[PDB]
Ligand binder design. Structure first.
Ligand code: SF4
Ligand code: SF4
Ligand code: SF4
Ligand code: FES
Ligand SMILES: [Zn+2]
Lengths: 693, 240, 123, 117
């Protein structure tokens, strides 16, 4: 229960056993700190957080001192001021005079706490000078300047405890103690870039970003990452027309304050390979063209081609926003087509988990649900690639409580112990009828995590049948307080696509289209497009589909528009445009509105308010931002969508394979990024830099 | 626990608590091993009652200070971590915790180290500073940086390449480390310096005069008017 | 709600075709200080055509949006909403996110493990 | 020499004015516009103008590459870029460079290279 103490005269009540710095923070008292961080284990090595406690004779470390009832604490005594000056004096004596060349300058806690709590001038003029440190190479993402290191050990605690990358540590002793790997090893983890945020000083910096900006010259915009389906909340720092960097912001229910390396470093893909003017194919070459020319060409191809019903096929890629998908579907329906497909394998057919209830394709346990887990079954899913921050969440839960994790599918390099039950559907049948099935039956908060990659299999229904039967039986897995059935999407647009029903009709998957419209669709193959088909590509980068196209239309990227995205949780989130689109590119829903007017079927909304209206018409949860609400239809959905229609499906003998071959390049932006290509070569498994033994 | 507190325990239990209490004064009772080292005629290791006078301990176990009690500069009672005793306090001081604490030192591990008038106390304290710089684990900033700064200052004080006010600064420097660290190695590192300043300031002032007459005029940090940076190095100065 | 729009002298387009955002600054990920996170900022969403473009002479960034650098500070979300209504500004409120509290204990770094260690803590 | 314009016509420029600096032919930064691109994008304002009068500063990267490595005994070289002839503080902030790793190591401020020996 909560106990009560006094800090600087004020009365504060805090849960028993919490650290004194937590009570100080709760009571609105500011305490300087370096090594303490809310998300890392307490260290107490920097000594900046000293306070006086009447029982204590000497000042105590606030970050590590447990609160007690009736405690009397003073943060403002002359002894405390003196101690702050003493500690800052000792911290600055070997620190390098690097501020003009250091990337931390202007957003540096050492600078700021020197100004607030330190002496105005130093006393250290020794003629033997300062200690110097070797620099260390830990890969192409994190540049090191280790003279600046103040030995707070935040990087080590993050790399060990949170990301599960034990290669980082501290070697030597005393004055010669050094953070590093003791020999040339990459800091090899998809979460590595977070250490740049955690380093209080410029010791670990963003290597692609180096020297390009100072913090005071950056416009800051709160927006949403679209590199995966987690929907991490981010701050985009831009200057003028270009985006400089991407940093996490706190959302304790989504990414908590981390992002993965793709979300952080694929931003440089937004300034290269961009689509800036409409293109028209003439022979074997593209030619630049006006918007009027290109839209007219689309209209003439439609008149000539004359698609009937489902000969107009629409395909939505991994990165598109909901408004664009809604406009594309409305225009496609007004053309008489029901052929609105997704860009994934077998996305010509409808998904086998169904579209009727949201709880059939979502993470029904919230992301925060993973904190309560006692047993987890992973089915055809490698979270470390599909949702990196959620993988970190699973590891944190595993480290702090007993929890049993098993998986059916490819062997995965995991940051937590996993029980491999085999790679086949027969293995799943055995498991759910065996010991781990019993584990799930007995647990208080079980959850089964199904990957979006199983949906893309032909035999998908088989799997969704098996799981479904099990779920319909086990009350611990599905009851009125807890839904443990979870589908983990990998692409930021899939949950919203299913939300608006961007799904083909049964007869539409039979037809051979004469006209194909790709909306950010760069997973398409040669096979998926008929040769006679007239192909329109709408996007922001030139990767694959643009190469397949007859007419190319430049659209805005996610940093250039205020879009809606639905994450795996079913959470509807709204982004903010940092910059405008380059050149002659356009907001994508406006593109669709114009082209529908060229096609006769001119859509009924030309304004942003009207588009948000239409969205509310389609689904009321798309306009209710940052909210998660449970389904009342949890039992109906499982029977009606997973167990019902999937009886006839015959399971294949083919083993489950890894869904994403390369974590670093998955969509058009990441495949346009020089940083992602460098990192893909640098962090490969067969490279000794990534091999501890 | 220490090995001597554990090793005496069965004898204590056999012979009774009152008997062990009978040796040494109140609150300093029993018999401790007293290793004696340094500038005594005969170094030794032996056990004795607590509260024994220092003069008597020396004369009767170790053959006395090399040169006689006139030739004694100081004594460190207990190991290097405790502040050194000047010549005129050990004539009256008892080898307890209470008596040593009252004169602002301690028993420590009862490791006596005597220093006669032929040796340099400044060099000995400099060596202790070097030891503490080498033995810091490096976890906490006040110790990890302060021990190195203390060693640099003591290297300059050894030759006299420093200004007199810097002594006060050195004193303040020890207070940066004392009471601010995770463990008590930092306090141990601060204490011998403080004993040195308190007891032998004029020694340091004499060495400073010797340098200033001998070599030249020195600025804070040990710089001098001909000293500057050249092609990677500092030239124009001794560089302790 | 008094329509002070019509007495300020501002352009009509400001209360017709512009949207503002009302929010609190997020705690920066780079620093531990929270001094800038309590105020309620009001600022304008960007306009696509007028936001920023490259000058062909020297390379400076030109702009046609006269609000691009303006940011109002309010002591409460309610004061900001009141002001925005009094100016006829269409707005969106972004509710702030805060760190969920949990109990942290230094001693937890040394808890005895009865089975196989899940990881080696290093300090 | 001959640069093809967006018009499709030819711009002639003497070879020596296509060099990024008199002491260097190519760019030394990814964001740096080359002389050829500058003329292609700004030729209107270069017509009836004398290129030989335009500013042509020497590239500092080659000049610093010409300076010999300084060899140092210990683990740490110290640099401040001071002017020993003038009074006052005329160099850069005094920094310490670690030379334990193989090869030469550059001063962050002035580019002077140090090496252990
Ligand atoms: S880390 Fe901070 S104090 Fe150190 S050089 Fe960089 S900006 Fe300056
Ligand atoms: S590199 Fe940065 S985060 Fe790591 S110990 Fe040094 S100062 Fe702390
Ligand atoms: S005081 Fe103790 S914990 Fe701190 S650096 Fe020195 S030896 Fe390590
Ligand atoms: S924050 Fe408490 S000692 Fe570092
Ligand atoms: Zn230099």
């Amino acid at each position: 229960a909560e106990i009560e103490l006094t800090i600087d005269g004020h009365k504060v009540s805090i849960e028993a056993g919490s650290a004194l710095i937590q009570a100080c923070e709760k009571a609105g008292v500011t305490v300087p700190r370096y090594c303490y961080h809310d998300k890392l284990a307490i260290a107490g090595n920097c000594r900046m957080c000293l306070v006086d406690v009447e029982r204590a004779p000497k000042p105590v470390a606030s970050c590590a001192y447990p609160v007690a009832p009736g405690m009397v604490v003073r943060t403002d005594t002359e002894r405390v001021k003196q101690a702050r000056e003493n500690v800052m004096e000792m911290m600055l004596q070997n620190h390098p005079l690097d501020c003009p060349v250091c990337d931390q300058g202007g957003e540096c806690d050492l600078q700021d706490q020197s100004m607030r709590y330190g002496r105005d001038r130093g006393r250290f003029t020794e003629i033997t000078g300062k200690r110097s440190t070797e620099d260390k190479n830990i890969g192409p993402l994190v540049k090191t300047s280790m003279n600046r290191c103040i030995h707070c050990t935040r990087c080590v605690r993050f790399a060990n405890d949170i990301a599960g990358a034990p290669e980082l540590g501290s070697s030597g002793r005393g004055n010669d103690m050094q953070i590093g790997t003791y020999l040339e090893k990459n800091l090899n983890t998809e979460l590595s870039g977070n250490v740049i945020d955690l380093c209080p000083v410029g010791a670990l910096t963003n290597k692609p970003y180096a020297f390009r900006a100072r913090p005071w010259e950056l416009k800051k915009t709160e927006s949403i990452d679209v590199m995966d389906a987690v929907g991490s909340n981010i701050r985009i720092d831009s200057k003028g027309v270009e985006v400089m960097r991407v940093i996490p912001r706190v959302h304790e229910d989504v990414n908590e304050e981390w992002i993965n390396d793709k979300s952080r470093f694929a931003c440089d893909g937004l300034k290269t390979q961009r689509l800036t003017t409409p293109l028209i194919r003439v022979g074997d070459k593209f030619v630049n063209a006006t918007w009027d020319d290109a839209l007219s060409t689309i209209a003439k191809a439609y008149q000539q081609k004359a698609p009937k019903g489902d000969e107009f096929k629409a395909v939505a890629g991994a990165l598109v926003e909901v408004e664009s998908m809604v406009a594309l579907k409305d225009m496609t329906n007004a053309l008489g087509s029901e052929n609105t497909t997704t860009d994934t394998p077998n996305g010509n057919s409808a998904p086998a988990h169904g579209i009727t209830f949201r709880s059939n394709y979502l993470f029904n346990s919230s992301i925060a649900g993973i904190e309560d887990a006692d047993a987890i079954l992973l089915v055809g899913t490698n979270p470390r690639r599909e949702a990196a921050v959620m993988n970190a969440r699973i590891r944190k839960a595993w480290l702090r409580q007993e929890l049993e994790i098993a998986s059916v599918g490819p062997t995965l390099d995991a940051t937590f112990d996993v029980a491999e039950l085999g790679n086949t559907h027969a293995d799943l049948e055995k498991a759910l009828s065996g010991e781990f099935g019993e584990v799930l039956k007995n647990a208080k908060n079980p959850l089964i995590i199904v990957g979006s990659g199983i949906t893309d299999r032909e035999d998908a229904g088989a799997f969704f049948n098996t799981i479904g039967k099990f779920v319909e039986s086990t009350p611990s897995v599905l009851n009125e307080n807890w839904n443990g059935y979870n589908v983990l999407q990998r692409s930021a647009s899939r949950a919203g696509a299913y939300d608006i029903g961007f799904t083909p009709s049964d007869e539409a998957s039979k037809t051979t289209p004469k006209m194909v419209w790709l909306l950010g669709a760069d997973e398409v193959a040669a096979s998926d497009i008929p040769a006679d088909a007239f192909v329109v590509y709408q996007g922001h980068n030139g990767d694959v589909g643009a190469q397949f196209a007859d007419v190319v239309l430049p659209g805005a990227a996610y940093t250039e528009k205020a879009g809606t995205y639905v994450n795996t949780e079913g959470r509807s989130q709204i982004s903010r445009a940092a910059t405008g689109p380059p050149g002659g590119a356009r907001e994508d829903w406006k593109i669709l509105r114009a082209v529908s007017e060229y096609l006769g079927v001119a859509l009924p909304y030309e304004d942003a308010y009207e588009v948000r209206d239409r969205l509310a018409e389609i689904s009321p949860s798309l306009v209710r931002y940052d909210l998660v609400e449970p389904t009342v239809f949890g039992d109906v959905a499982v029977q009606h969508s997973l167990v019902g229609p999937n009886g006839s499906v015959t399971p294949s003998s083919a083993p489950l394979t890894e869904t994403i071959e390369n974590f670093y390049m998955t969509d058009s932006i990441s495949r346009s990024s020089p940083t992602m290509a460098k990192s893909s070569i640098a962090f490969n498994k067969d490279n000794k830099k990534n091999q501890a033994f | 626990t220490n090995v001597e507190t554990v090793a005496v325990a069965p004898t204590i239990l056999r012979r009774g608590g009152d008997w062990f209490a009978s040796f040494g004064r109140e609150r300093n009772s029993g018999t401790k091993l007293f290793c004696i080292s340094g500038n005594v005629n005969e170094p030794c290791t032996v056990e004795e009652e607590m509260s024994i006078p220092l003069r008597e301990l020396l004369e009767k176990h170790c053959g006395g200070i090399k040169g006689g009690w006139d030739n004694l500069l100081g004594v460190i009672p207990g190991g290097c971590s405790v502040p050194i005793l000047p010549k005129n306090i050990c004539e009256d001081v008892l080898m307890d915790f209470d008596a040593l604490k009252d004169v602002q030192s301690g028993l420590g591990t009862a490791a006596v180290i005597v220093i006669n008038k032929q040796q340099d106390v400044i060099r000995a304290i400099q060596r202790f500073a070097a030891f503490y710089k080498h033995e810091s684990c490096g976890q906490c900033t006040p110790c990890r940086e302060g021990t190195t700064w203390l060693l640099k200052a003591m290297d300059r004080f050894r030759t006299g390449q420093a200004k007199e006010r810097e002594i006060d600064m050195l004193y303040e420097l020890t207070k940066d480390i004392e009471g601010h660290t995770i463990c008590a190695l930092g306090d141990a590192a601060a204490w011998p310096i403080q004993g040195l300043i308190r007891n032998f300031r004029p020694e340091m002032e004499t060495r400073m005069k010797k340098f200033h007459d001998e070599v030249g005029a020195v600025s804070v940090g040990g710089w001098m008017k001909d000293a500057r940076v050249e092609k990677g190095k500092v030239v124009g100065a001794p560089l302790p | 709600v008094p329509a002070h729009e019509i007495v300020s002298g501002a352009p009509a387009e400001l209360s017709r075709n512009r949207v503002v955002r009302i929010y609190q600054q997020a705690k920066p990920a780079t620093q531990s200080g929270e001094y800038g996170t309590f105020a309620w900022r009001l600022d304008w969403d960007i306009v696509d055509v007028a936001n920023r473009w490259e000058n062909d002479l020297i390379g400076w960034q030109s702009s046609g949006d006269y609000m691009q650098a303006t940011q109002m500070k309010f002591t409460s979300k309610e004061s900001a909403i009141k002001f925005a209504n009094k100016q006829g500004w269409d707005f969106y409120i972004q509710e702030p996110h805060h760190r969920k509290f949990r109990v942290k204990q230094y001693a937890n770094n040394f808890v005895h493990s009865y089975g196989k260690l899940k990881h080696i803590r290093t300090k | 020499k001959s640069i093809i314009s967006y018009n499709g016509n030819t711009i002639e420029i003497p070879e020596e004015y296509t060099k990024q600096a008199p002491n260097r032919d190519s760019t030394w930064a990814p964001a740096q516009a080359s002389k050829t691109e500058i003329y292609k994008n700004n030729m209107v304002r270069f017509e009836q103008k004398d290129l030989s009068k335009q500013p042509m500063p020497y590239a500092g990267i080659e000049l610093i590459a010409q300076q010999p490595v300084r060899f140092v005994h210990g683990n740490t070289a110290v640099c401040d870029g001071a002017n020993h002839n003038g009074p006052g503080a005329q160099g850069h902030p005094k920094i310490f460079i670690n030379v334990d790793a193989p090869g030469s190591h550059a001063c962050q401020y002035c580019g002077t290279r140090y090496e252990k020996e």
